[PDB]
Design a protein around this ligand. Structure first.
Ligand SMILES: CCCCCCCCCCCCCCCCCC(=O)O[C@@H](COC(=O)CCCCCCCCCCCCCCC)COP(=O)(O)OCCN
Ligand SMILES: CCCCCCCCCCCCCCCCCC(=O)O[C@@H](COC(=O)CCCCCCCCCCCCCCC)COP(=O)(O)OCCN
Ligand SMILES: CCCCCCCCCCCCCCCCCC(=O)O[C@@H](COC(=O)CCCCCCCCCCCCCCC)COP(=O)(O)OCCN
Ligand SMILES: CCCCCCCCCCCCCCCCCC(=O)O[C@@H](COC(=O)CCCCCCCCCCCCCCC)COP(=O)(O)OCCN
Ligand SMILES: CCCCCCCCCCCCCCCCCC(=O)O[C@@H](COC(=O)CCCCCCCCCCCCCCC)COP(=O)(O)OCCN
Ligand SMILES: CCCCCCCCCCCCCCCCCC(=O)O[C@@H](COC(=O)CCCCCCCCCCCCCCC)COP(=O)(O)OCCN
Ligand SMILES: CCCCCCCCCCCCCCCCCC(=O)O[C@@H](COC(=O)CCCCCCCCCCCCCCC)COP(=O)(O)OCCN
Ligand SMILES: CCCCCCCCCCCCCCCCCC(=O)O[C@@H](COC(=O)CCCCCCCCCCCCCCC)COP(=O)(O)OCCN
Ligand SMILES: CCCCCCCCCCCCO[C@@H]1O[C@H](CO)[C@@H](O[C@H]2O[C@H](CO)[C@@H](O)[C@H](O)[C@H]2O)[C@H](O)[C@H]1O
Ligand SMILES: CCCCCCCCCCCCO[C@@H]1O[C@H](CO)[C@@H](O[C@H]2O[C@H](CO)[C@@H](O)[C@H](O)[C@H]2O)[C@H](O)[C@H]1O
Ligand SMILES: CCCCCCCCCCCCO[C@@H]1O[C@H](CO)[C@@H](O[C@H]2O[C@H](CO)[C@@H](O)[C@H](O)[C@H]2O)[C@H](O)[C@H]1O
Ligand SMILES: CCCCCCCCCCCCO[C@@H]1O[C@H](CO)[C@@H](O[C@H]2O[C@H](CO)[C@@H](O)[C@H](O)[C@H]2O)[C@H](O)[C@H]1O
Ligand SMILES: CCCCCCCCCCCCO[C@@H]1O[C@H](CO)[C@@H](O[C@H]2O[C@H](CO)[C@@H](O)[C@H](O)[C@H]2O)[C@H](O)[C@H]1O
Ligand SMILES: CCCCCCCCCCCCO[C@@H]1O[C@H](CO)[C@@H](O[C@H]2O[C@H](CO)[C@@H](O)[C@H](O)[C@H]2O)[C@H](O)[C@H]1O
Ligand SMILES: CCCCCCCCCCCCO[C@@H]1O[C@H](CO)[C@@H](O[C@H]2O[C@H](CO)[C@@H](O)[C@H](O)[C@H]2O)[C@H](O)[C@H]1O
Ligand SMILES: [Zn+2]
Ligand SMILES: [Zn+2]
Lengths: 244, 96, 217, 52, 124, 102, 79, 62, 88, 96, 79, 124
């Protein structure tokens, strides 16, 4: 029986029959296989064609699972993400901010944007979801959504007021010191792109000025470029609070 | 979802996935009706050997016909009376 | 998978709203120094995250005890909190809930000759919170058992409907004792959950993570 | 009126409230009563057109 | 199910100028919210049958255990003392006042719903 | 007749709530008429902020309490401002409230 | 009104009451110990013993005793 | 009288099962129902000054 | 005009055909959502507080059962009966 | 039918049928609130006497304060120790 | 066709199967005798006895015995 | 619910002579019998959840009792001998032929329904 198991192993338990079981529920199976590290381009081509007649009827949890799965596999199928962005645009009231921040980060990984998608995502975060949902988001996810709107030039000041609520000493403090640097430097470029300087930009600038040794000389120049621009917009002087 | 996939999965296994065709047993076997007779006794022989391999060091409650499993032949596994085999197993268990 | 439909303004919804808002009122959130706006909104949500759910826990313990206490006043029924392991098991569970909340703040490390005496006053809250519930459900029912036996000795000995006024006066004192046990059943569920807000609310303190940077004027 | 709507609610069809009326606890105001009468005239939408 | 205001707009626009005023009560009823009529009376639910038989089985189980007790006659007369207060609570408790006292415990029922006003949403 | 459907749907919806709320209104009809309000209220219970309006009452935050109720009914104006954004897009303009300095 | 809609649904239990009565019964039947007045015996003793000797008088009290302490069965007379 | 039970762990785990069911039933079945009914009233009462002002500025009817 | 697609899943009128089903909360839909988002993040102090009491009372049950075993073996070794009598 | 009548029946008894008005207890009693206090103790006194009359020849488990029910005074009903009262009852039972 | 109407109704039990499982369980729990390897004892004996002495070895067989006749508990050593 | 033939007679009589032939497919669909459409998929019924958990609880209870038996390894291998025939019956049994053999057992399905003929009920 040393070879009867090995004969069964080379023909039955193959990656191709792992795919043939995975064809029934692609948003479930591609999400959990890629979570286990199975990020293979040849299988995710077969995932993209199996789910394409089913995308328009997918739920918001299935769309978010499918979009995160194709981000971890790093596979871009433009006809798949067209139907994915047509599902988000048709059901934007049903989507959540926690789900849309994962969908936007996939749409920002490979540059894929529509003007209807940017409007329906901004309407979903600002009006269809709770206004304190960016507080629960995590600042690394909100800075990705800010960069995605800055790169497409889409100015939505109602969205920018909602996303800026998530930046604080709480949410930036939960990040790694290297990860806080990339979050601060990408949120300050997006706030300077639209010319929007909310009151919660004091936490983004203050996260850079309380620890400037992580930042370079040219980075502290563009931080204090935003700091003087927010000082004119908010009408005051920047001061660091010390507890006591 | 969890039930709708499992119905679609087992339907593919019951009908579409056949190991009689994928392994090419038409060369070795005559009929599909004699393959399922060999798959029947093959299922019994595996389930006998798996249930014994799941716990091999046991004294058998079934009567062995004067035969011993491995190189034991005097241990608690081969003892006829079970009251003696319980005392011999307790000495073997504390060492191992 | 199909949840039931609820009428708005139903009496159990209005009763449980006022009950939950009462135990939430016992540990109110602290007013910050800064005005609450979009700058201070994540610090308010984070301060709410660091607060324990004492409002939810106390109305859990209020409803589970006032239902158990009033079972002792229903016919053919006894109170579960008249048993020792039930009533004291709830009181040690509250004390262990307050201790685990207090230990999770510092390090999960347990904090000259003064502190052994303050420890005895703290670990007596484990006993006294559940025992006060247990003795009140036991001693009121035990006194009811003795006086019903002494009230039964009169019509047994002095005729069933022979003489009324002596067995009338003891059946009035017996009837006022069951009404007193109705008052104790509601009060001991209230005293338990008041003290649970007090004990858990001692460790319900975290520092406000306010703005580290500000654009003044 | 509001007390008339509580009397038609399922709470007052229950057993302990079968013989109770919501007007007995808090009676409707005359402004509440005259507006219930004014609304009954405007439930015919032809009358609301000719009034307006 | 489409919304009823767009059905009002569609039915008023499609009607003639001659029969507009007569057909306004028909358009009013087509946009009226559904209030389901009183269905046929059914005596007991399945879960109501389990609840009453289960409470009867529990009463008979506890009365059988009380009767086999050492102080058995004290246990059965404690059921008389306990059931007498259930009768007195049906007599003493102002069940309309307690209903409105509980109604004032929740802020959703203690006040009327203050929201959208008429002048802010007038459509001309 | 341009925006009469949105203005009369808000009137039709609130008049039906205020007639029936606290008396006999089912929770299913509330979640049918305002699905996004029930979605936002369910977010607070999910994220352990079910007492958040009690928390704002504890700290005296009357302006944050007014912001809380307005942001939870902010989807009532969303049918209008998606319509007015599409009107400005067909006429080539930018929408006013979508801009930072506009 | 919606009063006739709410009379359509009958009595219903609380939503997870089956899990409550499952947990309460499983705490009373999965005790891991003999059941309150009984003792586990050998299979040789159980088969040889009549039913009347297998019962004990304390576990069968009289339903309405004329004297406090009356038992329904007398048990084994062998001491 | 009955002072100590047959098992102290069984009576404590019964109290733990009953209180955890009430904790589950409150957080899952009662408080989502309570907060849907409370916060519909509470959000309307907290917005109605700003809601009616925002709606007044929007409609061109006047 | 504003034409009912702008208020499709946002604003609805009171229903005219049938009363719909109630929209479930996520906690009513699945216990796993309640366990991972609220029960373990917010209420693990109670669950650990219950776990303390069940294990502590199991220790006090073991001390009570060892006290019965010590008193049992003391009466067997002394030539006594460990229990007095039945009342019957 | 069986449930719809029983609801209509008890509704008439709970509200419409009042024995305070049909018996005219306003002459004897001051208030309706003091009638329900007497109906309370009257319910207790009946339920005490009915539970004792449902089985009168019993030895009491409650302590009688040195008193005897009827002309017994030496029988098993009046015995202090219950082990003696059980033996005296068995002689009384075979005769009666 | 009516095929989609019959897929609407799920699995259902036979119509009086609750009365069948009620009668089968009541024949197994209302036996009127001690439960298969146990013996009723006095309340004085039950309270004085530890749990390990109250159990018998025959009523606790080993789940997967290496020797036929292994018992999980040893019971009372007092004979 | 009125009957559909009287609705056919009412709709055909009320129609014009001009639009009679065009509206005949509309009157055909209004009298078509209702065939309910495929509803949304639901995974398990409540009674299907009791049946599968109850069979799983019964299997685990019987496997625990078989393993504690005296001839315990013979009991678990008898489950292998019994489950092997359940696999062989899925392979051998002609499930379409057995379906039509059972269909011929009842006289209601062994023949087609012979009843009312066309010429006897022709209405002229
Ligand atoms: C507080 C002041 C004093 C007030 C008066 C004293 C209080 C005690 C009075 C006793 C009356 C209690 C309520 C009366 C209930 C019986 C009458 C009744 O109305 O029956 C209805 C239902 O009554 C009951 O069934 C309630 C019984 C509750 C007892 C609970 C015992 C539990 C035993 C079973 C547990 C099994 C759990 C299974 C889990 C799946 C009929 O239901 P339906 O289907 O026709 O629809 C109407 C629904 N609104
Ligand atoms: C170890 C051996 C034990 C053997 C003893 C017998 C026990 C057998 C175990 C199986 C019996 C059945 C289990 C019941 C649980 C599953 C049913 C269920 O999920 O609940 C409801 C299904 O609907 C739901 O609500 C699902 C939600 C889950 C139910 C409860 C969740 C867990 C609550 C426990 C507290 C959790 C917090 C603490 C955890 C450590 C149905 O309940 P109902 O009949 O009372 O309501 C219907 C009335 N119309
Ligand atoms: C840090 C967070 C941890 C989370 C865990 C939460 C735990 C507490 C939540 C409430 C659940 C309590 C149920 C657990 C009971 C455990 C009792 C135990 O371990 O001992 C049993 C061990 O007994 C056995 O060996 C038999 C197996 C018993 C299993 C118990 C099943 C009941 C589980 C209850 C269902 C919980 C869910 C229902 C709704 C809340 C029986 O106790 P005993 O004193 O009578 O016997 C001891 C041995 N002589
Ligand atoms: C909070 C309430 C928790 C419940 C507490 C009530 C039950 C306590 C269980 C009793 C365990 C002790 C059993 C025992 O017999 O003592 C052992 C000794 O074990 C110990 O030393 C530790 C005992 C610590 C337990 C103390 C618990 C008391 C807590 C007081 C609160 C409860 C108030 C109501 C009590 C009825 C053995 O010693 P011995 O038999 O050899 O003594 C000679 C007598 N012939
Ligand atoms: C004076 C001569 C007597 C004449 C005899 C006839 C008069 C009736 C006497 C008493 C009969 C009691 C029967 C009550 C139970 C049956 C009523 C019932 O359950 O029907 C409805 C009414 O339910 C109730 O009656 C509940 C009322 C309970 C409230 C508590 C009242 C006072 C209780 C006092 C405590 C008593 C404690 C024990 C004392 C010994 C609910 O079911 P439904 O289907 O008809 O409703 C439609 C929904 N499907
Ligand atoms: C005969 C030739 C050989 C054929 C093959 C061998 C035979 C054995 C094969 C085993 C398969 C048996 C049937 C498979 C059932 C499970 C798969 C399934 O289809 O699940 C359905 C249901 O399956 C079951 O639940 C059946 C399970 C039956 C086991 C019975 C055990 C009883 C235990 C609980 C008793 C409690 C009684 C309570 C009384 C109220 C799903 O139901 P649904 O709600 O989605 O709607 C579909 C209805 N058409
Ligand atoms: C002595 C103490 C015993 C204690 C042990 C526990 C037993 C407790 C007894 C109560 C438990 C529940 C009793 C169940 C009977 C009433 C339920 C019923 O009537 O049956 C069905 C209600 O619907 C009916 O079919 C009513 C018809 C009556 C049921 C059976 C009639 C009697 C059959 C027995 C054989 C009679 C012939 C011989 C008689 C000598 C519901 O059954 P199902 O859940 O399986 O079906 C629902 C599936 N969707
Ligand atoms: C001429 C027509 C007569 C019609 C009557 C039809 C009777 C047969 C129909 C089928 C029903 C059979 C159920 C009756 C069982 C009677 C057994 C019995 O009398 O003895 C019991 C007496 O045991 C007891 O004292 C405890 C009480 C047991 C009550 C039995 C309840 C089960 C009833 C089954 C439900 C029937 C309906 C369910 C669906 C058919 C237990 O038997 P045992 O040998 O284990 O113990 C004897 C004493 N050591
Ligand atoms: C031993 C001490 C403890 C005893 C037992 C404790 C029992 C706890 C339950 C009682 C709680 C009832 O508490 C209830 O709180 C609610 C909160 O919604 C208050 O609710 C109401 O307050 C005020 C004034 O009445 C209204 O203007 C307001 O609209 C409404 O919210 C009620 O005034 C109060 O009655
Ligand atoms: C007709 C008059 C009606 C009066 C109604 C108001 C009184 C109601 C009585 C119910 C009990 C009052 O409840 C009371 O709540 C307060 C806070 O609110 C608790 O107060 C507690 O708060 C926190 C909790 O750790 C501690 O910081 C504080 O030191 C402690 O006193 C009391 O311990 C409790 O007794
Ligand atoms: C389970 C058995 C019962 C145990 C119940 C124990 C908790 C009882 C909670 C109710 C007690 C609190 O009682 C509460 O009193 C407050 C005032 O203080 C009332 O509050 C208000 O009532 C009404 C509002 O409609 C007005 O008169 C007024 O604005 C105010 O007094 C509450 O409506 C009432 O519910
Ligand atoms: C044998 C002893 C029996 C008595 C046992 C009692 C001890 C109970 C404590 C269990 C500790 C482990 O339990 C684990 O604690 C860590 C921190 O340590 C929690 O960790 C975290 O939880 C959530 C985040 O989701 C936060 O709200 C919390 O502040 C944080 O500490 C875990 O959510 C909990 O699962
Ligand atoms: C606050 C209310 C309670 C007041 C009483 C507090 C004192 C209780 C603690 C007594 C401590 C002595 O307990 C000591 O600890 C161990 C745990 O390692 C106990 O051991 C216990 O657990 C083990 C396994 O978990 C089992 O054998 C058994 O359940 C029990 O004996 C020992 O019996 C004893 O040596
Ligand atoms: C529970 C496990 C299974 C145990 C089952 C035991 C009972 C089995 C009953 C079926 C056996 C009888 O088998 C029965 O044969 C007769 C002929 O005799 C067939 O009767 C008919 O079949 C078809 C009709 O469509 C035609 O070929 C023909 O008219 C005739 O042969 C039945 O259709 C078949 O069902
Ligand atoms: C040990 C001896 C007993 C063995 C076990 C007995 C099993 C009993 C079940 C088998 C019964 C099946 O018996 C079945 O009877 C039905 C009655 O409808 C017959 O039914 C059919 O008969 C004939 C011919 O097939 C058809 O023309 C007819 O339309 C139809 O009614 C079937 O032909 C037969 O297959
Ligand atoms: Zn008692
Ligand atoms: Zn066998």
């Amino acid at each position: 029986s040393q070879n009867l198991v090995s004969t069964f192993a080379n023909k039955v338990i193959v990656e191709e029959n792992l795919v043939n079981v995975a064809e029934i529920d692609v948003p479930f199976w591609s999400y959990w296989l890629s979570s286990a590290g199975f990020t293979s381009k040849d299988a995710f081509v077969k995932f993209a064609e199996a789910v394409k007649p089913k995308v328009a009827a997918l739920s918001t949890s299935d769309i978010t699972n499918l979009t995160v799965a194709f981000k971890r596999a790093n596979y871009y199928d433009k006809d798949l993400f067209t139907g994915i962005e047509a599902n988000v645009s048709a059901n934007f009231t049903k989507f959540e901010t926690e789900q849309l921040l994962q969908i936007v980060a996939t749409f920002d990984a490979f540059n894929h944007s529509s003007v209807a998608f940017l409007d329906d995502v901004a309407d979903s975060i600002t009006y269809c979801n709770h206004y304190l949902a960016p507080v629960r988001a995590g600042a690394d996810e909100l800075a990705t959504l800010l960069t995605y709107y800055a790169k497409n030039g889409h100015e939505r000041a109602d969205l920018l007021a909602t996303v800026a609520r998530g930046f604080s000493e709480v949410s930036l403090g939960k990040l790694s010191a290297a990860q806080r640097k990339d979050t601060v430097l990408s949120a300050l470029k997006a706030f300077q792109t639209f010319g929007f300087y909310p009151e919660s930009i004091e936490a983004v600038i203050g996260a850079a000025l309380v620890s400037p040794a992580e930042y370079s000389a040219e980075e502290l120049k563009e931080v204090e470029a935003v700091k003087v621009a927010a000082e004119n917009a908010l009408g005051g002087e920047f001061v660091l609070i010390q507890e006591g | 979802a969890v039930t709708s996939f499992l119905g679609k999965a087992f339907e593919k296994y019951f009908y579409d996935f056949s190991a009689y065709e994928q392994f090419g047993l038409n060369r070795f076997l005559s009929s599909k009706g004699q393959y399922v007779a060999l798959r029947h006794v093959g299922f019994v022989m595996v389930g006998v050997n798996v249930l014994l391999a799941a716990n091999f060091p046991f004294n058998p409650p079934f009567p062995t016909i004067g035969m011993c499993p491995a190189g034991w032949e005097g241990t608690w596994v081969c003892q006829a009376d079970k009251a003696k085999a319980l005392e011999m197993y307790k000495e073997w268990k504390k060492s191992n | 998978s199909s949840v039931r439909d609820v009428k708005t303004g139903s009496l159990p919804t209005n009763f449980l709203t006022g009950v939950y808002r009462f135990w939430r009122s016992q540990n109110p959130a602290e007013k910050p120094h800064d005005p609450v706006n979009d700058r201070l909104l994540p610090a308010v949500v984070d301060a709410s995250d660091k607060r324990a759910s004492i409002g939810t826990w106390a109305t859990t313990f209020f409803c589970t005890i006032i239902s158990c206490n009033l079972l002792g006043l229903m016919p053919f029924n006894e109170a579960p909190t008249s048993g020792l392991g039930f009533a004291t098991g709830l009181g040690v569970s509250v004390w262990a809930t307050a201790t685990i909340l207090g230990l999770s703040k510092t390090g999960f490390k347990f904090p000259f000759i003064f502190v052994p005496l303050e420890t005895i006053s703290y670990t007596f809250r484990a006993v006294s919170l559940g025992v006060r519930l247990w003795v009140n459900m036991l001693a009121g029912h035990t006194l009811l058992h003795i006086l019903t036996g002494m009230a039964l000795a009169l019509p047994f000995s002095l005729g069933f409907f022979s003489m009324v006024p002596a067995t009338f006066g003891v059946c009035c004192l017996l009837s006022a004792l069951v009404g007193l046990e109705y008052l104790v059943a509601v009060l001991q569920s209230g005293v338990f959950s008041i003290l649970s807000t007090v004990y858990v609310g001692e460790f319900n303190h975290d520092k406000f993570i306010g703005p580290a940077a500000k654009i003044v004027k | 009126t509001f007390a008339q709507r509580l009397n038609s609610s399922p709470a007052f069809s229950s057993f302990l409230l079968k013989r109770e009326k919501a007007e007995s606890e808090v009676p409707p105001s005359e402004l509440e009563l005259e507006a219930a009468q004014k609304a009954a005239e405007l439930e015919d939408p032809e009358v609301a057109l000719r009034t307006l | 199910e489409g919304n009823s205001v767009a059905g009002i707009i569609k039915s008023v626009n499609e009607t003639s100028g001659a029969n507009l005023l007569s057909s306004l009560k028909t358009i009013k009823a087509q946009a009226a919210p559904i209030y389901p009529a009183a269905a046929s009376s059914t005596g007991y639910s399945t879960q109501a049958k389990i609840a009453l038989f289960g409470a009867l089985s529990w009463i008979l189980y506890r009365a059988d255990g009380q009767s086999k007790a050492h102080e058995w006659i004290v246990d059965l007369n404690l059921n008389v003392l306990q059931a007498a207060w259930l009768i007195s609570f049906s007599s003493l408790i102002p069940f309309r006042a307690v209903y409105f006292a509980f109604r004032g415990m929740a802020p959703a029922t203690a006040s009327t719903l203050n929201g959208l006003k008429t002048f802010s949403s007038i459509s001309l | 007749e341009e925006e009469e459907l949105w203005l009369l749907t808000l009137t039709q919806q609130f008049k039906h709530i205020q007639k029936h709320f606290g008396i006999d209104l089912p929770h299913s009809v509330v979640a049918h008429m305002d699905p996004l309000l029930i979605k936002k209220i369910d977010w607070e219970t999910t994220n352990a902020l079910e007492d958040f309006d009690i928390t704002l009452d504890d700290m005296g935050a009357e302006d944050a309490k007014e912001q809380w109720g307005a942001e939870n009914l902010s989807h009532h104006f969303l049918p209008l401002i998606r319509y007015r954004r599409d009107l400005a897009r067909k006429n080539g303009d930018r929408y006013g409230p979508d801009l930072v300095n506009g | 009104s919606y009063s006739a809609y709410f009379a359509k649904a009958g009595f219903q239990f609380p939503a997870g009451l089956s899990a409550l009565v499952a947990g309460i019964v499983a705490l009373n039947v999965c005790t891991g110990r003999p059941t309150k007045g009984t003792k586990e015996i050998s299979n040789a003793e159980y088969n040889a013993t009549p039913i009347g000797y297998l019962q004990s008088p304390d576990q069968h009290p009289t339903a309405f005793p004329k004297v406090p302490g009356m038992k329904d069965v007398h048990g084994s007379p062998h001491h | 009288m009955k002072l100590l039970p047959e098992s102290l762990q069984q009576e404590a785990a019964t109290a733990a099962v009953v209180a955890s069911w009430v904790l589950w039933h409150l957080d899952t079945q009662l408080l989502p129902t309570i907060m849907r009914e409370h916060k519909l009233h509470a959000c309307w009462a907290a917005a109605a000054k700003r809601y009616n002002e925002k709606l007044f500025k929007l409609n061109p009817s006047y | 005009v504003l034409g009912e697609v702008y208020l499709k899943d946002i604003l609805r009128t009171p229903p005219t055909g049938a009363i719909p089903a109630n929209v479930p909360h996520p906690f009513q839909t699945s216990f796993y959502t309640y366990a991972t988002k609220k029960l373990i993040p917010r209420h693990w102090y109670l669950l650990g507080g219950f776990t303390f009491t069940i294990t502590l009372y199991g220790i006090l049950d073991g001390l009570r059962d060892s006290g019965k075993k010590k008193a049992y073996d003391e009466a067997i070794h002394a030539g006594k009966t460990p229990y007095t009598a039945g009342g019957h």
